[PDB]
A paper describes a structure:
Encapsulins are a prevalent protein‐based compartmentalization strategy in prokaryotes. Family 2, the most abundant class of encapsulins, is further subdivided into Family 2A and Family 2B based on the absence or presence, respectively, of a putative cyclic nucleotide binding domain (CBD) inserted into the E‐loop of the HK97 fold encapsulin shell protein. In this work, we report the characterization of a Family 2B two‐component encapsulin shell identified in [name] (Sl). Through heterologous expression and purification studies, we show the differential assembly behavior of the two shell components – Sl‐Enc1 and Sl‐Enc2 – and demonstrate their ability to co‐assemble into mixed shells with variable shell composition.
In contrast, Sl‐Enc2 formed characteristic ca. 28 nm shells, consistent with other T = 1 Family 2B encapsulins. That is to say, the Sl‐Enc1 majority sample yielded a symmetry‐averaged Sl‐Enc1 shell map while the Sl‐Enc2 majority sample resulted in a symmetry‐averaged Sl‐Enc2 shell density. Sl‐Enc2 can assemble into complete shells by itself. Therefore, we used the symmetry‐averaged Sl‐Enc2 map to build a model for a complete homogeneous Sl‐Enc2 shell. The Sl‐Enc2 shell is 28 nm in diameter, consists of 60 identical protomers, and exhibits T = 1 icosahedral symmetry, similar to recently described Family 2B encapsulins. Overall, the homogeneous Sl‐Enc2 shell is similar to recently structurally characterized Family 2B encapsulins with externally displayed CBDs being positioned above all two‐fold pores. The two‐fold pores are large and elongated with dimensions of 14 by 60 Å and partially occluded by the CBDs. The absence of any resolvable N‐arms in the homogeneous Sl‐Enc2 shell contributes to the large dimensions of these pores. Two additional types of pores are present in the Sl‐Enc2 shell at the five‐ and three‐fold axes of symmetry with diameters of 6 and 3 Å, respectively. Symmetrical Sl‐Enc2 or mixed interactions never exhibited resolved N‐arms in our 3D classes.
Numbering used by the authors: 44 to 69, 254 to 471
The structure:
């Protein structure tokens, strides 16, 4: 279990028919199809019958599986090669640091490549390496407030931890800066609510059936995707040398 900041900060756009069209002006519009995170919830019939007195274990297992699905959605929206944010950045929007460690000069270059940068995402180990560079230069950044929470910030831009961002064996990671919202032509999240059997908005549970053994099976499905409206809404600092 982790703090899924990406799901909390991304706005969500309603999609009809499971498909979304974005006009590209460098040709043909790019089409986004919703992806699915599915799991089968298996419960023995004895548990569903007898173990409901202190707490309904059928609902307890349902919440446990839903949390696992949310963790997988967070992982896919960053690392997926089709629609992940680490692979859908324009080549002009990818920059490298002057030296190994992530210095305050590198952060200023990252936020100067687009208008109205709204959030920074980095691995918790990367955030620790950023703080060490601050201390060596004797600067103490103030901080910001986001969604009722107090978080760290740089030039007023909140910096949020995310453990889904990979760390290479050679102790390198990446930092992500993005603009948000459809009205700002930023990054948006794609989902479709109103599906027939909604346990949660955009999430469905179906009875499926019972097999030869007294095991009840359920199908849990969540549909999601992500899109970048304009190329200059996302930026990556590629090779940040953490660990020294």
């Amino acid at each position: 279990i982790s703090s899924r900041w990406l799901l909390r900060v991304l706005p969500w756009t309603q999609v009809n028919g499971g498909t979304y069209r974005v006009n590209r002006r460098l040709l043909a519009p790019r089409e986004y199809e919703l992806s699915v995170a599915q799991t089968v919830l298996k419960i023995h019939s004895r548990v569903a019958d007898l173990y409901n007195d202190p707490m309904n274990q059928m609902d307890q297992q349902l919440r446990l599986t839903v949390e696992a699905l949310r963790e997988r959605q967070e992982h896919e929206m960053i690392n997926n090669r089709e629609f992940g944010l680490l692979h859908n950045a324009d080549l002009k929007q990818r920059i490298h640091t002057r030296s190994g460690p992530p210095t305050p000069d590198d952060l200023d270059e990252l936020i100067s490549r687009r208008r109205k940068t709204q959030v920074l995402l980095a691995h918790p180990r990367t955030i620790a390496a950023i703080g060490r560079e601050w201390n060596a230069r004797g600067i103490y950044p103030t901080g910001a407030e986001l969604h009722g929470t107090d978080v760290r910030a740089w030039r007023g831009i909140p910096l949020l931890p995310c453990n889904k961002i990979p760390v290479t064996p050679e102790q390198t990671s990446s930092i992500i800066a993005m603009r948000l919202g459809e009205e700002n032509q930023g990054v948006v999240g794609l989902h479709q609510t109103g599906i027939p059997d909604e346990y949660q908005p955009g999430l469905s549970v179906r009875f499926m059936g019972i097999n030869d053994q007294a095991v009840i099976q359920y199908l849990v499905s969540a549909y999601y995707s992500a899109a970048v409206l304009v190329p200059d809404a996302l930026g990556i600092l590629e090779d940040v040398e953490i660990g020294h």
